[PDB]
Amino acid sequence: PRRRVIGQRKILPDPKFGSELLAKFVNILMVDGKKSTAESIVYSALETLAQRSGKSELEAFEVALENVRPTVEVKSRRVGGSTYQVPVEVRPVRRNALAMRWIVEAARKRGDKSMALRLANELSDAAENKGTAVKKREDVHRMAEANKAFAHY
Amino acid sequence: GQKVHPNGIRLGIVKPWNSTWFANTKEFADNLDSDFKVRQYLTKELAKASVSRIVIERPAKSIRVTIHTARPGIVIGKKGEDVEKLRKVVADIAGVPAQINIAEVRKPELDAKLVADSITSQLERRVMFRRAMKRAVQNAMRLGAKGIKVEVSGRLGGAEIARTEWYREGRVPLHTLRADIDYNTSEAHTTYGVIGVKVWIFKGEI
Amino acid sequence: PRSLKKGPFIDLHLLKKVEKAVESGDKKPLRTWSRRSTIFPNMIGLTIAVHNGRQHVPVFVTDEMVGHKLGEFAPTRTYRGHAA
Amino acid sequence: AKQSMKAREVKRVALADKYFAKRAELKAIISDVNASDEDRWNAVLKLQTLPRDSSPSRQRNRCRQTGRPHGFLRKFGLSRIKVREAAMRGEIPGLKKASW
RNA sequence: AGGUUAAAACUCAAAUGAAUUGACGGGGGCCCGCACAAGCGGUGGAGCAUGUGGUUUAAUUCGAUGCAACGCGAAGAACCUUACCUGGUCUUGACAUCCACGGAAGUUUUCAGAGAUGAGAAUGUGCGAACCGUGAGACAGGUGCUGCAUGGCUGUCGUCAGCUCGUGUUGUGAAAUGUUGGGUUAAGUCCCGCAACGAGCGCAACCCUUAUCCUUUGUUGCCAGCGGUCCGGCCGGGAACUCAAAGGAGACUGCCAGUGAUAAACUGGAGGAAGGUGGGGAUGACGUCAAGUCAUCAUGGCCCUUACGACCAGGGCUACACACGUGCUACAAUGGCGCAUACAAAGAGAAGCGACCUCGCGAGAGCAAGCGGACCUCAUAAAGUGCGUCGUAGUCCGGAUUGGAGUCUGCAACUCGACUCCAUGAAGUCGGAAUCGCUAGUAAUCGUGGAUCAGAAUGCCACGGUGAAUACGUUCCCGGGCCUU
Ligand SMILES: [K+]
Ligand SMILES: [K+]
Ligand SMILES: [K+]
Ligand SMILES: [K+]
Ligand SMILES: [K+]
Ligand SMILES: [K+]
Ligand SMILES: [K+]
Ligand SMILES: [K+]
Ligand SMILES: [K+]
Ligand SMILES: [K+]
Ligand SMILES: [K+]
Ligand SMILES: [K+]
Ligand SMILES: [K+]
Ligand SMILES: [Mg+2]
Ligand SMILES: [Mg+2]
Ligand SMILES: [Mg+2]
Ligand SMILES: [Mg+2]
Ligand SMILES: [Mg+2]
Ligand SMILES: [Mg+2]
Ligand SMILES: [Mg+2]
Ligand SMILES: [Mg+2]
Ligand SMILES: [Mg+2]
Ligand SMILES: [Mg+2]
Ligand SMILES: [Mg+2]
Ligand SMILES: [Mg+2]
Ligand SMILES: [Mg+2]
Ligand SMILES: [Mg+2]
Ligand SMILES: [Mg+2]
Ligand SMILES: [Mg+2]
Ligand SMILES: [Mg+2]
Ligand SMILES: [Mg+2]
Ligand SMILES: [Mg+2]
Ligand SMILES: [Mg+2]
Ligand SMILES: [Mg+2]
Ligand SMILES: [Mg+2]
Ligand SMILES: [Mg+2]
Ligand SMILES: [Mg+2]
Ligand SMILES: [Mg+2]
Ligand SMILES: [Mg+2]
Ligand SMILES: [Mg+2]
Ligand SMILES: [Mg+2]
Ligand SMILES: [Mg+2]
Ligand SMILES: [Mg+2]
Ligand SMILES: [Mg+2]
Ligand SMILES: [Mg+2]
Ligand SMILES: [Mg+2]
Ligand SMILES: [Mg+2]
């Protein structure tokens, strides 16, 4: 906004684990305000992921995030003449928001049976730098690489 | 743009209703239609009696009409003769026993309905519209109004292109809800068509 | 359609017109405006001329017209296609 | 509304009362489950003989002050236009501008 | 190359200078708004609903018709409505007044006719003046024309922060000042300065509602402690509580700290249900668009008068090569289907809402309580949750279309109703260019009610349940405010 009068909203931690980080991921996955339906999907995928690895539900989730979080992105910048895609540092919070959004978007595009299984296969490949989401993080880093010359606009 | 009706917006705040009975849905529509025919008759019969406001009540199987006026002797007549002639027509119309009360409008120069009717009668007599509005505004300001506004619209002076003109003195704060604002309108039927008159009179915040 | 517990509807003025002509040899066309009348199993034969809004069109009542209303055989709108 | 159109509703209101009881018992027969099959037939044929304007479904609520056949409100018996004019003049008891 | 000297015919009623107020700029500066950006969900594609253009028609009645017409007037066209068409009919007349004369008014039936109506035929004749019929002529009647003659009412810029006046002063004058400037604010908000000093209309406040608490009152509403109990606030009771609705309390940048021009104010903290306009509504300045409406009504003028008035039946407003707008339902597994099982708010009802019970596969029917309602009825909330199944298929997705058979409202559902049952099982597998809404209890999604109304919502108006994402910023797009050029 013009006036910059936008503070922050508190988010409740998830029931099973008490992680606000995970509770946002349920929110990104939720549609039509059906939160319980999204809570179940996340919990099921998290257990399939917990037994597909040796780590707890959280530590396997963080390892998935660490491979999808972008560090630098490009934003347009119209100045006296034309517009350059300037590479900008992604702030720590937006790193998590982008990582979660790409995971949920990639999993929705798969072709497995349930959404709980699709989310599980994406969270697993994200631990091995495979599949989409991880690739989306690669395409963003490439664009920000080819525009490093414009890192002062 | 368009303005809210100054009377309606204050009806529960500082202004009273003009009809004060109670009814269920079964007769609400029939009470409204009989109040309409009563006022339609009283207004036509008492055209020269300076009738400002006709208040109608309905205590119980009976109707009580209160006629606010500045010429009550004209309303009443000799030894209450004329006021009796209406007490029969009203009962005929309402279909219940009728009772008429005559209230006193003192200072008719401070009543919006009477001021609007004064200007309108003058316009039908081919008085200069400018002179009528100034007189009305000066009178009310002299009698102690805190403000007044008069507006006249139509083919003023028989002009081909209609227009609106208005004067104002003192304060007329239409956005203040607790402001005592007496507002009423009137219409003149000249040889060139209808001319509309609106009158606001401010009497102090409550 | 009309409830069964009420029986098919027939305009009373038409019911008299078919009675006065089934018993006789009146083969003159019956001119009616009663498109709402159900066709009964008693005038299979003669021609009722039904109104369509601007004239009476003759329908030759056969058996298979029983149960239909008269108006089903007198179209009201005139159409021939656009630019056809 | 036109004067003729106003007079059409006063006629339809009168005829709906003059034939009120005569219409109700005929439909009592037709709706009667355990009547016969020929008096039902006669009652059906007899109902069509009464003038059409005697059925209450032929009436159209009109603004009692103008005759407008649209925007009617039953609680006041007036069109939406006349309801507003009377409401702002304080001529409808208890009625004020709402806000919640 | 051209320079220099230098006409006329003809033609126009101006051409021109400086300055003033606006508006505008692909001029400058400073600000604002779901205006971008950051996001989430849609439209444009499909089927269907609905409005409009067009075409068609005897008629497809009239109006609205960039934003600001197109689920608009219409909060509900089978007849009615109805204003249109076809045909059948009337002429002081369907609706008023006046006069003459006839008759109480009314009820009860017969024929002709689609009906209007016509001709009758019975019964009453009560209590002038009711109320009918007829006869004259003043007149009535018109949804006929002009919204570019009008009143009233409305849209719109825009809920934008503006718009002005008196006196004074400046200028030959149009005009200027005030109203600009330095800060500040959501605000022409406030402070300070100042040839201005004051005032008005706007802003804010006063109003409704929502969030906390108190007091009073305690049934049809309530159940903490009691006492019984068929475990049902069911009964005795209880006035605590939830709640109902009256009256009060509460928020003021008041308090504290810093900042600031010893100012206005701002940034943060405390207390508090609530913190800086708490949330939402109502409230629309001077004016603008000869904006909309002569078809709500009113009205100047014009026009028609055995007709442009009035009555009737049937038809039409529902047409259909097509084009657009607004919606609804989908394309599925965050789902479909089956079973079980929770938790709302708001409202309506007497020619009305209609329980129970029985009958029907069902829409409904018969019988029949209760309720003009904190009591009775509408009236099971649905999403949700548990268990099963389906296993990615044009399918157990989707439900268009069509056949057959019914119900209900209504004189009457052919044109042209809604709903039910059985069968049928279309397009559609996420939508080109393009385009819309939304900043929080919002969007999205899920049901519920109401007005209109005999019947007839996917529209409109209202109500709760669940319940997000994102906003770094103001360069760009759109609209706007202030100063300057
Ligand atoms: K010359
Ligand atoms: K659409
Ligand atoms: K106007
Ligand atoms: K000068
Ligand atoms: K001055
Ligand atoms: K006119
Ligand atoms: K029709
Ligand atoms: K729709
Ligand atoms: K199927
Ligand atoms: K129909
Ligand atoms: K689409
Ligand atoms: K209805
Ligand atoms: K400028
Ligand atoms: Mg009229
Ligand atoms: Mg109707
Ligand atoms: Mg020379
Ligand atoms: Mg955007
Ligand atoms: Mg479409
Ligand atoms: Mg049209
Ligand atoms: Mg037009
Ligand atoms: Mg417009
Ligand atoms: Mg709309
Ligand atoms: Mg019709
Ligand atoms: Mg004709
Ligand atoms: Mg206009
Ligand atoms: Mg001077
Ligand atoms: Mg200004
Ligand atoms: Mg100035
Ligand atoms: Mg300043
Ligand atoms: Mg001010
Ligand atoms: Mg100043
Ligand atoms: Mg205000
Ligand atoms: Mg006990
Ligand atoms: Mg604080
Ligand atoms: Mg308004
Ligand atoms: Mg115009
Ligand atoms: Mg127009
Ligand atoms: Mg017109
Ligand atoms: Mg008709
Ligand atoms: Mg239509
Ligand atoms: Mg299915
Ligand atoms: Mg209802
Ligand atoms: Mg296909
Ligand atoms: Mg598929
Ligand atoms: Mg906003
Ligand atoms: Mg809904
Ligand atoms: Mg400003």
Q: Do residues B148 and B201 lie in contact, with contact meaning Cβ atoms separated by under 8 Å?
A: yes
CATH code, domain carrying A140 = 1.10.455.10
Outline where chain D has alpha helix (H): 3-18, 20-31, 39-47, 80-88
SS (H, E, C) A10-66: CCCCCCCCCCHHHHHHHHHHCCCCCHHHHHHHHHHHHHHHHHHCCCCHHHHHHHHHH
- What's the gap in Å between C12 CA and the centre of ligand 23? 22
Subunit contact D91:B22, Cβ cutoff 8 A:
no
Domain hosting A84: range is 20-147
Strand partners, C49: C31, C58
Alpha carbon of residue B140 to chain centroid: 16
Instruction: State the Cα torsion B120-B126-B128-B131 to the nearest 10°.
Output: -50
When divided into structural domains, chain B yields a total of: 2
Give the Cβ contact number of residue A19 at 10 Å. 15
Amino acid letter, C65: M
- CA within 13 Å, CB half, A124: 16
Residue in the structure block whose two tokens are 């849905």: B25
Distance from CA of C17 to the nearest CA of D (A): 14
Domain shared by B159 and B120, yes or no: yes
- What's the gap in Å between D43 CA and the centre of ligand 26? 99
DSSP A106-140: HHHTS-SSSHHHHHHHHHHHGGGT-STTHHHHHHH
Considering only CA atoms, which of B78, B52, B66 is closest in space to residue B20? B66
Size of interface C-D (CB pairs under 8 A): 14
A3 touches strand E (CB under 7 A): yes
Query: Helix A115-125 to helix A57-66 angle, to the nearest 10 degrees?
Result: 60
Among C10, C16, C17, C34, the strongest candidate for a mutation testing the D interface, having the largest count of D CBs within 10 A, is: C10
- What's the gap in Å between A11 CA and the centre of ligand 29? 44
Q: Do residues D54 and D15 lie in contact, with contact meaning Cβ atoms separated by under 8 Å?
A: yes
Q: Given the DSSP bridges, would you call strands B193-205 and B98-104 parallel, antiparallel or unpaired?
A: unpaired
Specify the long-range contacts of residues B154-158, CB closer than 8 Å, at least 24 apart: B154/B188, B154/B192, B154/B193, B154/B194, B154/B195, B154/B196, B155/B190, B155/B192, B155/B193, B155/B195, B156/B129, B156/B195, B157/B128, B157/B129, B158/B190, B158/B191, B158/B192
Domain shared by B199 and B176, yes or no: yes
- A5: in domain: no
Q: Using the 8-state DSSP alphabet, how is residue B16 labeled?
A: -
A19 touches strand E (CB under 7 A): no
B168 touches strand E (CB under 7 A): yes
Sheet strands (E) in chain C: 30-32, 47-51, 56-60
Q: Do residues B151 and B136 lie in contact, with contact meaning Cβ atoms separated by under 8 Å?
A: no
Distance from CA of C12 to the nearest CA of D (A): 6
Buried b (16+ CB within 10 A) or exposed e, B6-32: bbbbbbeeebebbbebeeeeeebbebb
- B140: in domain: yes
Q: Do residues B163 and B172 lie in contact, with contact meaning Cβ atoms separated by under 8 Å?
A: no
Considering only CA atoms, which of B195, B186, B173, B198 is closest in space to residue B9? B173
**CB-based burial of residue A45 (10 Å sphere; 0-12 exposed, 13-18 middle, 19+ buried)?**
buried
- What's the gap in Å between B200 CA and the centre of ligand 28? 30
- Chain D CB contacts of B30 under 8 Å are 77
Q: Using the 8-state DSSP alphabet, how is residue D26 labeled?
A: H
Chains B, D in contact, 3 or more Cβ pairs below 8 Å: yes
What chain B residue is nearest to D99 in terms of C-alpha separation? B9
Domain shared by B118 and B98, yes or no: no
Domain shared by B177 and B91, yes or no: no
CA of B162 to C1' of E168 (A): 37
Q: Which two tokens stand for residue A138?
A: 């690669």
Alpha carbon of residue D78 to chain centroid: 14
CA of A33 to C1' of E3 (A): 92
Q: Do residues A45 and A123 lie in contact, with contact meaning Cβ atoms separated by under 8 Å?
A: yes
- CA within 13 Å, CB half, B205: 8
| CA–CA gap between residue A27 and residue B2 (Å, rounded) | 46
| CA–CA gap between residue B12 and residue B93 (Å, rounded) | 29
Amino acid letter, B171: R
Considering only CA atoms, which of B138, B133, B127 is closest in space to residue B151? B133
Q: Which helix (H) or strand (E) holds A148?
A: none
Q: Given the DSSP bridges, would you call strands B51-57 and B19-20 parallel, antiparallel or unpaired?
A: parallel
Domain hosting B124: range is 107-206
- Give the closest of D77, D87, D94 to B33, CB-based: D77
| CA–CA gap between residue B56 and residue B37 (Å, rounded) | 12
- What residue ranges do the domains of chain C occupy? 2-82
- What's the gap in Å between A32 CA and the centre of ligand 8? 22
Q: Given the DSSP bridges, would you call strands C56-60 and B193-205 parallel, antiparallel or unpaired?
A: unpaired
Q: Do residues D26 and D2 lie in contact, with contact meaning Cβ atoms separated by under 8 Å?
A: no
CA of A64 to C1' of E394 (A): 37
Residue in the structure block whose two tokens are 């709906």: D16
Sign of the dihedral through C-alpha D23, D26, D30, D33: positive
Backbone dihedral angles phi then psi of residue C56, each to the nearest 5 degrees: -105, 125
| CA–CA gap between residue A45 and residue A103 (Å, rounded) | 13
- B9: in domain: no
Q: Do residues B6 and B200 lie in contact, with contact meaning Cβ atoms separated by under 8 Å?
A: yes
Strand partners, C20: none
- A15: in domain: no
When divided into structural domains, chain A yields a total of: 1
Q: Which two tokens stand for residue B102?
A: 């005559």
Determined by which method?
A: cryo-EM
CA of D22 to C1' of E366 (A): 24
Q: Do residues B185 and B206 lie in contact, with contact meaning Cβ atoms separated by under 8 Å?
A: no
Q: Give the CA radius of gyration of chain D.
A: 20
Give the Cβ contact number of residue B160 at 10 Å. 6
Amino acid letter, B23: A
Chains touching chain D, criterion 3+ CB pairs below 8 Å: B, C
| CA–CA gap between residue A122 and residue A125 (Å, rounded) | 5
| 3-state SS, residue C14 | helix
Query: Helix A35-52 to helix A20-29 angle, to the nearest 10 degrees?
Result: 120
DSSP B130-163: HHHHHHHHHHHHHTT-SEEEEEEEESGGG-SS-E
Subunit contact D89:B28, Cβ cutoff 8 A:
no
| CA–CA gap between residue B94 and residue B79 (Å, rounded) | 25
